[PDB]
Amino acid sequence: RILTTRNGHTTSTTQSSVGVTYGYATAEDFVSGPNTSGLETRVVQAERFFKTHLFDWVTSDPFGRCYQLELPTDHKGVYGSLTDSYAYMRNGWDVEVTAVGNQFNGGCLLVAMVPELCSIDKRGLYQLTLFPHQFINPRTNMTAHITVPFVGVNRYDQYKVHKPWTLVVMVVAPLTVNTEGAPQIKVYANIAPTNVHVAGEFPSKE
Amino acid sequence: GIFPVACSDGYGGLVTTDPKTADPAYGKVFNPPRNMLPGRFTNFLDVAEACPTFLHFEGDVPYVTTKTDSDRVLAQFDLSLAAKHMSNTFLAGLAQYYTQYSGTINLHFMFTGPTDAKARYMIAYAPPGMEPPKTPEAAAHCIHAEWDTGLNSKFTFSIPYLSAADYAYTASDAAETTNVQGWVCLFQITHGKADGDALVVLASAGKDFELRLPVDART
Amino acid sequence: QVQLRESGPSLVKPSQTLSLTCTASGFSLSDKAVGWVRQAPGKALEWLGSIDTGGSTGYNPGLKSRLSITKDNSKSRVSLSVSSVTTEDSATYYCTTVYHETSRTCPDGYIYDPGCGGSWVCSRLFPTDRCIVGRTT
Amino acid sequence: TSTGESADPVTATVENYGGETQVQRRQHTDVSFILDRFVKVTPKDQINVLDLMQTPAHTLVGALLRTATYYFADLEVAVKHEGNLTWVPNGAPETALDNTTNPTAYHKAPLTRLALPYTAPHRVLATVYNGRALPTSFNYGAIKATRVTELLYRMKRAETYCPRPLLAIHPSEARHKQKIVAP
Amino acid sequence: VLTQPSSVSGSLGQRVSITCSGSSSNVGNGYVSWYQLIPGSAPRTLIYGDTSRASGVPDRISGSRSGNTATLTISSVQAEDEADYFCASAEDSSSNAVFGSGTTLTVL
Amino acid sequence: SGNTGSIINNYYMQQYQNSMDTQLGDWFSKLASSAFSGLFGALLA
């Protein structure tokens, strides 16, 4: 079950992927809208992976210890600059958390891409499942690969004021390194925009 | 048996905007012939769209006297229809009573002066989210145009409408620190012997400007 | 043989303030804490303030909210504050060295297992089940 | 069954072992048909801003509406009020509730039932917004009256676009013993 | 605070002991030190390492510890030893120092 | 469509009764319908 994704020029290869999990849609639609006068352009040299170290899944991590990332997260390079120069930006995400285990570690780690995470009380975690999600228990695999479209109350969005997606990685069953586990399993995230768009170029600063 | 109706409850109150029509009290009136009168406009977004009107400025006048010594910015104002610069135009006058405008706003800058003035201006629409520019070289990265003034006087820059919401409000006034719709800046990049000669700016509606949701505050 | 001294008057008038001093000199005068001692006659001694080379001090909530202690460098002095004095506090004041330490230790049947991270650090030996002990201190 | 651990919508049917699963009927859950009920909202004295979030978090509507990140409703408010009742569209400034040129139903013995359109300048409103208090722009207007004592929203033509967790009351002793009606 | 007998006495040339009864939190798990304290002048450290004696300290002052109990044995007491004796210790429940009662030695 | 059962062509025109809709240019039902049912391994007896 090899799954060699690619976005732009930055592939990712994983030899244990359980499969891609499209959340809420198979393909984003209708970028060209009336709330811009057609002045939108589609940036294409900015759809590339970028790693973000998430957290240290350490064995003493009870149920429901979740680490929320606000997407889009602070970025640098070709992207990060697009946000720095465009009043309105729009993009659907592709998120690939690659926690790596020694296939002797037991826990059921649940990765979800929730829209507009504001507050989840300790109980809401039990139903957090109804969200584009994938479990990454080390025994069956390591790689969770969610892809989501752009959800929002607007065609386009202002990234400084609003972050639409919260990447939530909740520890469902704590890590038991019973005989030969990794002592502490780190968790990274290959996150990558898709179907980027921009509008309304900001003035210079210099 | 009489037809039963069971007149329901909570209905039939006088609603000032209801679609119902009143009950006739007088009949057979035959008003005199109103046909083929000279000037008839069906909806006010024809007057606003085909007849431009002036814009108020820092100095009370419609024009903007060219700056001379070092500063190239002539006018810079928020795009909301409540702006002091646009408060006197028929467009804002009509947009008091509506809530959400959508489409476009044209700005007709006609340069009035001596033939040898030969000035060169620039208008740029700085979207919201960053302090608006204060120098043409810093504003050039925006949706901006430039135009000489040789023979034709009027130049109509169609200010775009790009925003997240498919409709933006017509009222500037609330607790806001910064403009929501974005500044519009008008720079005079360079000028010849036209120093002291006015630029008469006008406003209008666009080929797709639309308002909706009528509401009357005490104007 | 550190030659220490507590300085001040033998008595303090109630409704008025008292201050003290603590000299310490010698080769070893700076390698350990400079604490204070008083004696309640017929009762347990009240643990007063302390200090270390960097102004680091250890107090008990018994009299902490009424002791304030500063250090003087040139003569190696340290001062005590008895705030809201009383006739019962009349007693023989002293400045001493004091010792306090805490060893995070491990469980009886588990090894330190330093490589394993997090709160759970100790690990089984014969069973070989690692990272299962939240080691007591 | 014994499938894999990805997000696969595999629901084990009764047919796996001996048996038969048939005729599932799902009327009474269709988002259009459960949402269309009048929900009571604690009104303000004289001026309240219609926003379907003002509903409580434990009514059949106020809790089946917060299970949807984006909702498109069209609301049919029904008010009980002492004087003329003026409804200004959203982003209709204050001091526009006093002018009777806005939809202003006169006093009636029964509660006045208006049928307000959905005026917000947005594709779909939201229930949570990543910015405790949603933006000022998610409304349907405001009801200005001398006194308001009962205010019930109704969501006509509802369509909700994302799910989100509901939470039932958490009991003890493994059973939430209620007192069901019984003669 | 620890418990010591606040009245102890001894004659010239005899060996006097100063006792201190502690608990599992301060003596049974932590160190204990002893000192000799004259009025108007601060002590000199006397007994550390739970059995050892610092340089300069005459070996006539010796220490010991067993369980929650600690002692200060002063062999051959002389007129200069007429002073106050105090105990030190480290406790965990208070997360900070806890001390004895203090013993005035009256040389008869 | 939902919780309206009066079988009579509504009196007020559609534009005045509801907010008309405009188009441009149903996923959870698809998800639940495309749900792996039955079994995953050879079945016996």
Numbering used by the authors:
A (entry chain 2): 13 to 218
B (entry chain 3): 1 to 219
C (entry chain H): 1 to 137
D (entry chain 1): 2 to 132, 157 to 208
E (entry chain L): 5 to 112
F (entry chain 4): 15 to 39, 66 to 85
Source paper text:
Three B77 or F145 scFv molecules bind to the FMDV-OTi capsid around an icosahedral threefold axis. The structures show that B77 contains an intermediate length HCDR3 loop with 18 amino acids, but F145 and R50 contain ultralong HCDR3 loops (50 and 61 amino acids, respectively). F145 interacts with the VP2 BC-loop (OTi-VP2T71 and OTi-VP2S72) and the HI-loop (OTi-VP2V189, OTi-VP2N190, OTi-VP2T191). The side chains of OTi-VP2S72 and OTi-VP2T191 form hydrogen bond contacts with the side chain atoms of F145-VHS119 and F145-VHT128. The amide nitrogen of OTi-VP2N190 provides additional stabilization via hydrogen bonds with the hydroxyl group of F145-VHD129. A Ser→Ala mutation was found at position 72 in VP2, which is also located in the virus-antibody binding interface. The VNT results showed that FMDV-OTi with the OTi-VP2N190S mutation exhibited a 2.9-fold reduction in VN titer, and the OTi-VP2S72D mutation resulted in a significant reduction (~30-fold) in VN titer. Structure comparisons of FMDV-integrin and FMDV-NAbs show obvious clashes between NAbs (B77 and F145) and the integrin receptor, suggesting that FMDV neutralization by B77 and F145 is facilitated by blocking virus-receptor interaction via steric hindrance.
Foot-and-mouth disease virus (FMDV), a small nonenveloped single-stranded positive-sense RNA virus (genus Aphthovirus within the family Picornaviridae), is the causative agent of foot-and-mouth disease (FMD). As the major antigen, the virus capsid of FMDV comprises 60 copies each of four virus-encoded proteins, VP1, VP2, VP3 and VP4; VP1 to VP3 form most of the capsid shell, with VP4 lining the interior surface. In the current study, we isolated a NAb (R50) that neutralizes FMDV serotypes O and A. We determined the cryo-EM structures of FMDV serotype O (O/Tibet/99) in complex with B77 and F145 scFv, as well as R50 scFv in complex with FMDV serotype O (O/Tibet/99) and with serotype A (A/WH/CHA/09). The final resolution of the cryo-EM reconstruction was estimated by the FSC 0.143 cutoff to be 3.90 Å for the FMDV-OTi-B77 complex, 3.68 Å for the FMDV-OTi-F145 complex, 3.94 Å for the FMDV-OTi-R50 complex and 3.49 Å for the FMDV-AWH-R50 complex.
